[PDB]
């Protein structure tokens, strides 16, 4: 391959998401009085927007991502039910349909959170993985990616604290022990609600041709075995079209139970490449080298 | 905030989402979600640019008549597809184009309508008392342009 392009045609538009029962407790930027005590199930309805992120990767192998994940706790310690699970980095292969990170950390929420109530809906049961730029460029063939581009930005909008039990106590030397109405301490953990900034159209990385002349791998863009992968992440063209449908068309007064409400989303792509023909002369000096790269390369040719 | 300019020999071609003809496998109910289909047409003077709400018809696809403001409540926001216009075999649809646009969210709201598709109940844990009933699972943003400048 020599040059690619990735085209879009939907207009540049933000998205939105949020939970009907999201684990908030209170608000923490300004407390006029001290926080009230919390009963059972004090969650509420919050929405937010995700951080703006764009991406493009091109390689002869699938791209390698990472995220945090639970491992096996050490045998010597007594496993009390309700303790903190282990944390360990996990290297997998990314797939279409896997979520990107949203500024909430890159971790499998399924095993690490039993609440199902701390993130919004679309990432609540799926994983979110950040691509490993370190491991892919340290692949000593260079077959994972030829070249890559990225832009991202975020900033804090609101500052909450979560309802839920103190999993690890605060030491009694950090703070002077309170009294009276504040003998019992408030919740220590917080989490921020992220937000992307304004999306514009100077900072687009699509609809532009990308000619490549070199690459940081030794593989100078050669599709071994007649295969090619292209990764595209884009949250800038993410409008959520809201539609309705009416039950009856005869009534003359607005009633709420006559219209059902649905959300649908559209997204579309197209790809255009150039390939240049490349021949290889064959010698036993050369054939041992390709036999060490990959088994199926020399096998598919009948040489 | 949006600006563009197009020069061509033929009229320019637009695109927008629209309702098609569904398969009659299930009988259509009063209040079923209509199907979608990408429709191409010619742009005329008087149609509306997309204003951060999706290039969609707002008569057939939105029968409530109270989800967008007045200017697009009956008109159809169209967006010019550059993909079909550059891929023409002669290139008479356009031969010169420029565009800039920007947008960001100001406020976040709910849709006060019937929940057409409920969330599957493995994605949460059922509460009790005040929170035994789920709030509306439909949100929508209110867009807003940024600063206009002279450069």
């Amino acid at each position, epitope marked *: 391959c020599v040059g690619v392009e990735v085209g879009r045609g939907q207009p540049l538009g933000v998205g939105i998401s949020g939970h009907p029962l999201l684990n908030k407790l209170d608000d923490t930027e300004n407390a006029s009085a001290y926080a009230a*005590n919390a009963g059972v199930d004090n969650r509420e309805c919050i929405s937010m927007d995700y951080k703006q992120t764009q991406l493009c990767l091109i390689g002869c192998k699938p791209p390698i991502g990472e995220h945090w994940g639970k491992g096996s706790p050490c045998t010597n310690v007594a496993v009390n039910p309700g303790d903190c699970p282990p944390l360990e980095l996990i290297n997998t292969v990314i797939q279409d349909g896997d979520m990107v990170d949203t500024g909430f950390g890159a971790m499998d929420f399924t095993t690490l959170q039993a609440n199902k109530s701390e993130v919004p809906l679309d990432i609540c049961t799926s994983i979110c993985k950040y691509p490993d730029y370190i491991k892919m460029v340290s692949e000593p063939y260079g077959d994972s990616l030829f070249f890559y581009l990225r832009r991202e930005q975020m900033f804090v909008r609101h500052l909450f604290n979560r309802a839920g039990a103190v999993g690890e106590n605060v030491p009694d030397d950090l703070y002077i022990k309170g009294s009276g109405s504040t003998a019992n301490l408030a919740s220590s953990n917080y989490f921020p609600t992220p937000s992307g900034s304004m999306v514009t159209s100077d900072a687009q990385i699509f609809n532009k041709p990308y000619w490549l002349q070199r690459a940081q791998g030794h593989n100078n863009g050669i599709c071994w075995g007649n295969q090619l992968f292209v990764t595209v992440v884009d949250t800038t063209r993410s409008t959520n079209m809201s539609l309705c449908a009416a039950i009856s068309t005869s009534e003359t007064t607005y009633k709420n139970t006559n219209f059902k409400e649905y959300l649908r989303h559209g997204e579309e792509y197209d790809l255009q490449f150039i390939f240049q023909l490349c021949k290889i002369t064959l010698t036993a000096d050369v054939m041992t080298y390709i036999h060490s790269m990959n088994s199926t390369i020399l096998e598919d040719w009948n040489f | 905030q949006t600006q563009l300019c197009l020069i061509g020999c033929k009229p320019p071609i637009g695109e927008h989402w629209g309702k098609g003809s569904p398969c009659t496998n299930v009988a259509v109910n009063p209040g079923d979600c209509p199907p979608l289909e990408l429709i191409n047409t010619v742009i005329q003077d008087g149609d509306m640019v997309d204003t951060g709400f999706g290039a969609m018809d707002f008569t057939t696809l939105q029968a409530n008549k109270s989800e967008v403001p007045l200017d697009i409540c009956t008109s159809i926001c169209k967006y010019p597809d550059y993909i079909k216009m550059v891929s023409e075999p002669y290139g008479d649809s356009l031969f010169f184009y420029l565009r800039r646009e920007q947008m960001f969210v100001r406020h976040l709201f709910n849709r006060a309508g019937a929940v057409g598709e409920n969330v599957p109940d493995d994605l949460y844990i059922k509460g*009790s008392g005040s929170t035994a009933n789920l709030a509306s699972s439909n949100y929508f943003p209110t867009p807003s342009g940024s600063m206009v400048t002279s450069d």
Partner: antibody
Amino acid sequence: QSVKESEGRLVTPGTPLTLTCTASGFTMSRYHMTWVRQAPGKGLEWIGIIYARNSDTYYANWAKGRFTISKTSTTVDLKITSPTIEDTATYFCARVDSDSSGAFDRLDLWGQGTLVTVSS
Amino acid sequence: DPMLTQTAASVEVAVGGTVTIKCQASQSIGGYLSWYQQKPGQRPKLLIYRASTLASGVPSRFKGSGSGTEYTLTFSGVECADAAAYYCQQGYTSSDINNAFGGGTEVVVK
């Protein structure tokens, strides 16, 4: 701190009955309230619970249809609809001192408790 | 329904003895558990909550332990004013339960 009650009455079965409960220092819209009943022999029996800002209630299994807990910002109280003979016992009102998450049934600062009895 | 039985009438103890009151639970409740002393003439009065943290104005000669489903409460150096009634109590605040958190007594110390 101190928890106060209304004075007891010797009543007849078939008459509604109330006991108000006022507090001294803390405000009641912050914490929770619960009622327990001390019968002779052993008896020590918990009635229900009421929360602070959610203002929800949860009763015992045998106690549904039989008690209604009312609360204002100034006073909490409980109510009896149809008394049966064997509720001649001692009632108590106490504050649920809890934390940012629990609302667990620790009753830290109790009330002094008065005697209510029914007779026919 | 989490149930704490406490089917244990207390044994006669002298001055300075040690008593092991054991309160067992059917369902796992975590650490949320309370204890109370009931003198038979006045209001009840609490000693320890969450099985480890004692309250104000109470001497540190009372002990707290136990985790999971079974818990205990020990102390030593029994005075004259320890003739009271004891009660273990959980905090799982469920709906369909009929707890009453009952059981527990203490003899008059010789």
